[PDB]
Amino acid sequence: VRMNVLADALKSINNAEKRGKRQVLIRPCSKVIVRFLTVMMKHGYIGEFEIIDDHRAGKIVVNLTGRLNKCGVISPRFDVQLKDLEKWQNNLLPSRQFGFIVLTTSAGIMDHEEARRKHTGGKILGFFF
Amino acid sequence: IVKPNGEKPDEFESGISQALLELEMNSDLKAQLRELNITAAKEIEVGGGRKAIIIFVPVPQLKSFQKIQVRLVRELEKKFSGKHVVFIAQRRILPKPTRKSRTKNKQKRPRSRTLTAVHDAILEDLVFPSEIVGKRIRVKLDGSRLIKVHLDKAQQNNVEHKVETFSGVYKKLTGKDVNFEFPEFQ
Amino acid sequence: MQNDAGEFVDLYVPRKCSASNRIIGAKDHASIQMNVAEVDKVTGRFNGQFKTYAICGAIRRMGESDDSILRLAKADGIVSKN
Amino acid sequence: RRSKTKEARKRRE
Amino acid sequence: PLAKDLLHPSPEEEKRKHKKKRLVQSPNSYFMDVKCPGCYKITTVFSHAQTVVLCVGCSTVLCQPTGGKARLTEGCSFRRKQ
Amino acid sequence: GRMHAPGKGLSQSALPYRRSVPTWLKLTSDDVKEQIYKLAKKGLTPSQIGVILRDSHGVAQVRFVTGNKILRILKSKGLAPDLPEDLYHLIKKAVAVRKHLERNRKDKDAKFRLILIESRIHRLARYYKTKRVLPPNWKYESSTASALV
RNA sequence: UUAAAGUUGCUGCAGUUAAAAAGCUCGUAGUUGGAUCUCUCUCGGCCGAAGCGUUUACUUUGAAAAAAUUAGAGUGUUCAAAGCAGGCCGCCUGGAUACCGCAGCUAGGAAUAAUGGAAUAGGACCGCGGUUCUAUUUUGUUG
Ligand SMILES: [Mg+2]
Ligand SMILES: [Mg+2]
Ligand SMILES: [Mg+2]
Ligand SMILES: [Mg+2]
Ligand SMILES: [Mg+2]
Ligand SMILES: [Mg+2]
Ligand SMILES: [Mg+2]
Ligand SMILES: [Mg+2]
Ligand SMILES: [Mg+2]
Ligand SMILES: [Mg+2]
Ligand SMILES: [Mg+2]
Ligand SMILES: [Mg+2]
Incomplete structure (x- = not known):
């Protein structure tokens, strides 16, 4: 269903x-x-x-x-450490220049970018570019 | 005729309850008004200095106030001259249980007492002679919100001179931004 | 586009469709740059002025190049309400 | 217990 | 096609969409108000009515149920409510 | 889709947006409740009652008017089914299929539908066991089936 | 034996005709699962010990994680692979740092995902009554 x-x-x-x-x-x-x-x-x-x-x-x-261009989701939600993030984006996004990985974190839902700032990890939701 | 929970009466409450007393003596509604009481009252500014009266009643009496609500508003208006009087039930908001708590939490809070539910029973009450038809939450490119609210098209000429008064009321208790539209029809 | 220093490093800056906002391709020959003229509101004669549109080759096949031209015109007030 | 609360309800009512 | 106000449908069209697929779900049946001619009495009835309903005193049979809507017996007036 | 059938279809009710009891309705909460009570004392399930009100009495949803949903009214007043009326129906239908199935043994189809109806029974039952509407020794048994209905 | 092999595929392949979807449906374990809800008193010098809040998963942080090896500073083994040495006219220095899955501890965070709290009210919160029990102070000490 x-x-x-x-x-x-x-x-x-x-x-x-x-x-x-x-x-x-x-x-x-x-x-x-x-x-x-x-x-x-x-x-x-x-x-x-x-x-x-x-x-x-x-x-x-x-x-x-x-x-x-593309809007997507990653199922299941994976738990993404801070250290992992790089790998993740380097797999997902068209470039270092643009696009985003969206995760939920203890802080809130946000961009890989903003979470890097806040120094939090969390779970992946999806991405867009 | 006022019964505050905090137990201390005010100067608005004074004349307003007195107004109700006058409506117990001089009006056809005597029995109902004897039974009923009000907990609280306020005055606010909306729409270019225009003034609005807010009357808080205890919840179980609300559906009783709904009986006489229109008559009450006419008379109480002419007692208070130009003002717009609107009735709202007094509502408990039980803070969201968290990992950090004492026991103020023994039994769970019922959905009925909760932020969203209350804001919608307030919204429900404000408009009373009008039903609510449909509600549309729009989002700004800013990240701010606004709420369109649709009302019965039949009661239009009844409430349509008030409108932006509500918009002020809701904003002062709730804190959200609300507009009111009358749909063509279904 | 711009390096750190602020120069525009690029061969050319491509045009995006006016309807659907896709980039009009270097070689896409189904593309249109359409010119619509402006009258003088007193006379009804021709100004020398015109408002221009672009439509990529995608939307032309879908036939909805027409619909989009139209509501673009309405957004420019070159077509009457109704 | 049951009887006590029920009777408590009728005596409260 | 490529431009539609999903927010403001035409009421004409919305009478035509299926009762769950409207922008907000709206029942297609209405409560009606039935009067058998020989009696003064008013009855409230459901537009799509199962069972069979009765004016009490005259034992007047108000309607037979069918697949979609109840069909009232002849001469019996009805008024949809609000 | 359907759980046990191939068929996938849309037939249902859509409740109107407005939850406010309309003006015309002249019944109290309590009037309706008395109505309900005697209508259960004529021995009707929740389903029956609801429809009956909807047809003659202009009560769209008992829920809105009297504030509680039907089965809770009846279970509070103490007149309620022992086992939830749907699980009842399922069992009655299963019974009937067996009763015809003894006399016609050669019928394969009926035999198969029986298995379906049984499986539905058990899912339903185990639901009522996790939700404690049933004593958790309770067991559908082919033999005492006839009794329960 | 590793890459090449997206020819074992979690990332990441296939299954109409190339290799390939079970004759068909029920079905237990297994995997998966729709919306919905914004901390407080007893001691000590207004703050620490005392509490708990339903519990987890997730996350960040701390401490613990043998050395050798690997990554990585310093250092002209004459260069380098190395080594842990050396360097100044008795002095001056080195011999760092990171990484160390999972499990287990520690302190924050509360989005996501589980899970609980009151439905024959044997519910919360109030304070008032009785019944039984027993610890200890007090009647200058002992009973
Ligand atoms: Mg199935
Ligand atoms: Mg290989
Ligand atoms: Mg490779
Ligand atoms: Mg292959
Ligand atoms: Mg072949
Ligand atoms: Mg083949
Ligand atoms: Mg097949
Ligand atoms: Mg299973
Ligand atoms: Mg969910
Ligand atoms: Mg080591
Ligand atoms: Mg090394
Ligand atoms: Mg660990």
Whole structure:
């Protein structure tokens, strides 16, 4: 059945992107999906989005800028040490120059970059570029 | 006719309870108003200095206040002249249990008392003569939020002169930014 | 793009589609740079002014080059509301 | 116990 | 195609989407208010009604159930509610 | 999909957004509860009751009006099924399939559907055992099946 | 024997026709699992000892992790592989540092993921009553 809603969300937006669509309807939504999208949004890869609140689970409608090539998830969530991070990004990202690994950490959800700053490890969620 | 939990009355509470007394003597509602009480009251600034009255009632009496709410608002308004009077139930917010705690936690907190639930019962109450239709949380490119709230289109002419008063009210208790729209229809 | 010193090191700076924002390829010959003219609002004659669009070859096959041209025009007010 | 709480409920009610 | 307001659908269209796939899920049935002609009495009924319902005093049979909606007996007026 | 069938389909109810009891409804919480009580004393499951109210009495969801969900009302007032009414139904249906299955031995299909219905029984049961609605010695047994219903 | 081998594939391969998906369904263990919830009193000089908060996993931090080897400083073995030496006109110095899976300790963090807390209220929190028990002070000491 449906497990890992995050995965299904980002598949959907990545597809609506390759299709070159303007908006997306991604459902259901999560307090995780939301903070992920937000971290994505601060760097601009996406745009503003709006949460249709239904009495059950969310739907989220996302506005889109062509700036997103790939958006992905890594299942299972792996526990990523600080020391490991390098390896991870060097595997995942197109370049040292750009793109992000998003992890949840004790601090909050964030970018590999910002966590490097805060000196925290955590679990991997996904990545984008 | 006021019963604060902290047990100390105020100057707003004084005239407002007195207003209710006057509505017990001079109005058709006497029995109901005898039964009921209010816990608290406030005044605030919204929409270019326009003034709003906030009336906190004890929760189990709320659905009773809902009976007479419109009449009460007319009369209590003309007693207080131009102001906008809105009723909100007094709500317990039980702090989120953490790894660091004493035992203030013996039995678990019920969903009913909790941040999100309360903010939505507040929102529920504010608009009272209007139902709530649908609610849309929009996010700014900033990372800030705003909440569109949809109301019954039938009750429109009833509440549509208030509107931005709510927007101020909600902001002062809750702390979020809210707009109000009347949908065309379904 | 820019090195540390701030020079632009690049052969050329490619144009992105106006509709869908993809990069228009060095050799993509299905691409369009379309010129739409501006009238004088009093007369209805031609100014010498124009607003320009680009559309990559992807969107042309999908046929939705048309839709996008259109709502681009609306966003420029070259097409009336309704 | 059961009887005590039930009777406590009727006597509180 | 490539431009749609998912946020503001046309009400026409939303009457046409399936009851779970609307932007927010809306029941397709409504409570109706039935009056058999020879009686004064008002009854509240469900639009899609299983069982069979009755006006008490006249033993008037209000409706037969069917697959989708209950079909009321002839001459019997009804008013959808709000 | 369906758990035991190939078929995958959409048939359900969608509850309206508004949880507020509408205006027209003239019944109290308590009126409805008395209604419920006598309707259970005519020996009906939760399902029955709910639909009955929905049809004649204009109660969309008993839940909204009286604040509690149906089965809790009945179990608080003490009139409740011993075993949860669905598990009841499953067992009755399983019984029936056996009763026809003794006389027609040559039927393979019925024999197979029996196994399905049984497996469903056990999943359900073990659910009611982890959730303590059943004494955890409780066991579906083919022979005493006829009794429980 | 290692790479080449993305020809053992966790990263990372395949399974319509090239090698390959079970005749079909039920099914226990196994793996996997939807939304949802923003710390406090007894002692000591307002702060330490005393508590606990449901418990874990995850994470960061501390201390412990034999030397040799490996990574890595210093040093013209005449160079280097080495060695741990040397260097100044009796003095001046070296002989560092990192890494050390997992397990086990330590102190922060509370996002994620488990898990618990009240449903015939044998629930919390209040203070009032009885019944039984027994420790010890006190009636200048002993009973
Ligand atoms: Mg199955
Ligand atoms: Mg090899
Ligand atoms: Mg290799
Ligand atoms: Mg191969
Ligand atoms: Mg062949
Ligand atoms: Mg073959
Ligand atoms: Mg096959
Ligand atoms: Mg199993
Ligand atoms: Mg989950
Ligand atoms: Mg060593
Ligand atoms: Mg070495
Ligand atoms: Mg360790």
